[PDB]
Design an enzyme around this catalytic site. Sequence first.
Site, short mmCIF file in Angstrom:
data_model
loop_
_atom_site.label_atom_id
_atom_site.label_comp_id
_atom_site.label_asym_id
_atom_site.label_seq_id
_atom_site.Cartn_x
_atom_site.Cartn_y
_atom_site.Cartn_z
N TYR A 41 0.44 -1.36 0.14
CA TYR A 41 0.28 -0.30 -0.02
C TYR A 41 1.11 1.41 0.27
CZ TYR A 41 -2.41 3.74 1.47
OH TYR A 41 -3.18 5.03 0.89
N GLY D 26 -6.90 12.57 5.24
CA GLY D 26 -6.33 11.58 4.05
C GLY D 26 -5.12 11.47 4.42
N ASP D 27 -3.47 10.19 4.12
CA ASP D 27 -2.73 10.11 4.88
C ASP D 27 -1.48 11.16 3.97
OD1 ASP D 27 -3.02 7.73 5.15
OD2 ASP D 27 -2.73 6.60 3.19
N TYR D 28 -1.96 12.22 2.79
CA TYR D 28 -1.20 13.19 2.48
C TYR D 28 -1.79 14.31 2.84
CZ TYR D 28 2.29 10.00 0.63
OH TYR D 28 3.26 9.32 0.38
#
Lengths: 94, 94, 197, 197
Positions: A41, D26-28
């Site tokens: 991922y 979100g991850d970013y």
Amino acid sequence: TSGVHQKILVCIQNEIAKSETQIRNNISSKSIDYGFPDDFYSKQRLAIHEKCMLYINVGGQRGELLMNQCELSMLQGLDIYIQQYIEDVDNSLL
Amino acid sequence: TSGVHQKILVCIQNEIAKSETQIRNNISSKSIDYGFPDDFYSKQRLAIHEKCMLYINVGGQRGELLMNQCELSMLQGLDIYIQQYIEDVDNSLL
Amino acid sequence: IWPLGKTSEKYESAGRGPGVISTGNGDYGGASYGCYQMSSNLGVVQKYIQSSKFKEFFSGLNPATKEFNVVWQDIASRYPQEFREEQHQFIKRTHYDIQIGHLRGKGLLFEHNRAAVHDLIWSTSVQFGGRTNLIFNALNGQNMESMTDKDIIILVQDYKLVNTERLFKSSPSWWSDLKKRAVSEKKALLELEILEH
Amino acid sequence: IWPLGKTSEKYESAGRGPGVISTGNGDYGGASYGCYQMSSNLGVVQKYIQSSKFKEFFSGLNPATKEFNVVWQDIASRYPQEFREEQHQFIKRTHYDIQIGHLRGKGLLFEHNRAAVHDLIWSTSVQFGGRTNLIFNALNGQNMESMTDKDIIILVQDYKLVNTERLFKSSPSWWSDLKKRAVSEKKALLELEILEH
């Protein structure tokens, strides 16, 4: 949102978050016939990031919308790809 | 090919080679408004490889066909994406 | 006296000697080796060398390199029969045996039959994997006698042929050849089953 | 006395103080800072801090962290006017000035006009980038007098409005709002041009 840039960003980013989550949940599911590498991922997510980030060069807020909209499209694709892969391994092995 | 596995592989791999080449040629083209990082192709190409390689787990020759056919599809997508990006930067800046 | 896998060799080995090396096109094309063309890109030739009596000939060398290739063809020319045979055995272990073992656990036994059914098992295991469910599915809901070698052959070959599009969605360009292959092997296997007795 | 960029502030700053920090999903998603919400994910807040008189307050700290955020809001509460003003100047340099400079080289001069045209330049430069060609294109083939502030405004605002779909292909979900914005700013800018004189 009423056209407020940041509010648009929040909306898209919430969709991105949902997509990321659905993808990690698929990958995590435990049967080693699927064979997802450990950092699968995170390496795919990163690759998607670097690709979409080029859209900033298009300029200003518009660049960010396109960038964020690209990340969403790539993740939606990645997710469908992974689901499909999982379905094919499932109905092929025994 | 007459159904010979290896001959099928050669055909698909020739298409892959053409796609890779067209993508490196786009990226290489010199105007730093596009802003492609140094190892952009190689990192994207690799990410595409790891993704498509899962298809081996589907089993035997069929897995290889699907794998090679996935690499081709991902590269065709990457290429179109890059062309589009280049066209958008070109008609947006001055 | 019937070489196991002979019915489908034209699709797998296609008359290649054990020294045949082909260089792959594309960044990840690598090199493919021997009668069955073990791909270095897929890790297959490396696994084979790990297990080969010829292992130490390749010490410190890596696939898809000029030096590796000189060793590979030296072994092919000094031991054509040994090399060929061991390559065949490696494919047997990685496919045939696996499918035989899994069918045994799902209840299906072939200990043993005419070469034809075993050529079907070989062919099907190399094309779809040592763990494919295609045979077990072709035979689903079926009393395991009143089942001749001929019925078995017709059943799984018909199954392969009607599922060609489901099994190869991504590759509609290769459907025509993939169907020709399943039909062609059906005919060969029926002829072989008769020559069997 | 007309604050530069006031016409489009509701889309850019939306009444935020200089201490406003938002955490991204979100991850970013990272964190976004100040009146204009400089994104750490885009590298923007880092660049601003590099240039800020407050640079050393943040020494050894990184964005999107609890510690950074305490410093950021301390500065906002001790220097609300200074912080706000410098943030505005950073946006001016990174957008407005750049568009002014590029239009100067393409032949277009505004030295200077009513706040309305400069609010158009600001708005357009923040939304489409300091190097956008949208103004230069809206005005293509046009004698640079017989061109009032009013004509200029109508021209580029009509251009923005008809090119909304070309400019935002990927995002057809946000078209309705993006068109409402261009229309809304056209009206505001015409009212401002009159109040100008």
